[PDB]
Amino acid sequence: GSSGSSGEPAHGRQHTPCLFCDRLFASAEETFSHCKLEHQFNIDSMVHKHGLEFYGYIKLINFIRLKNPTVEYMNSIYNPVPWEKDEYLKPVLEDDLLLQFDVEDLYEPVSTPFSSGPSSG
Ligand SMILES: [Zn+2]
């Protein structure tokens, strides 16, 4: 047995679990995309749908972490939302990447005339 390699070192890394499942992902983007492929669920749609504000978005995340509902439900929701609680604001998990994700980026100023003219065809 010439080959002799034994090591149990640790590398400081960050990982964020999934909302629906318990899958870890190096970064947030990874998860979101994963859900859009498997759970066929988009997080961006929510922010725009329930106009989740800076804090709102946070509640939406933790909400799934605590409640742990199903995609089907995610689509079938109404006001008051099941995440309209402060308690949710708190990070259900530790060093939650998703929570860090800049939701603002999602907000796009519809000022530029970019392809301005719906139903042009
Ligand atoms: Zn998942």
Is the alpha carbon torsion for 63, 69, 75, 79 positive or negative? Answer: negative
3-state SS class at 25:
strand
> How many domains is the chain built from?
1
In a domain, 86, yes or no: yes
- H or E element in which residue 16 lies: strand 16-17
Question: How remote is the CA of residue 67 from the centroid of ligand 1, in Å?
Answer: 15
Ligand 1 centre from 69 Cα, in Å?
12
Q: How was this structure determined?
A: NMR
Yes or no: say if 25 and 18 are a contact pair by the CB < 8 Å rule: yes
Residues 6+ apart with CB under 8 A from 70: 20
DSSP state of 101: S
Distance CA 56, CA 87 (A): 12
The whole domain housing 65 covers 14-108
The backbone region for 18, taken as left when phi is positive above 0, alpha when psi lies in -120 to 50, beta otherwise, is beta
Tell me the H-state helices in the chain. Answer: 28-37, 43-49, 54-66, 71-75, 86-89, 97-100
CA of 16 to the centre of ligand 1 (A): 11
CB of 39 within 8 A of CB of 27?
Answer: no
Residues 83/43, Cβ–Cβ less than 8 Å:
no
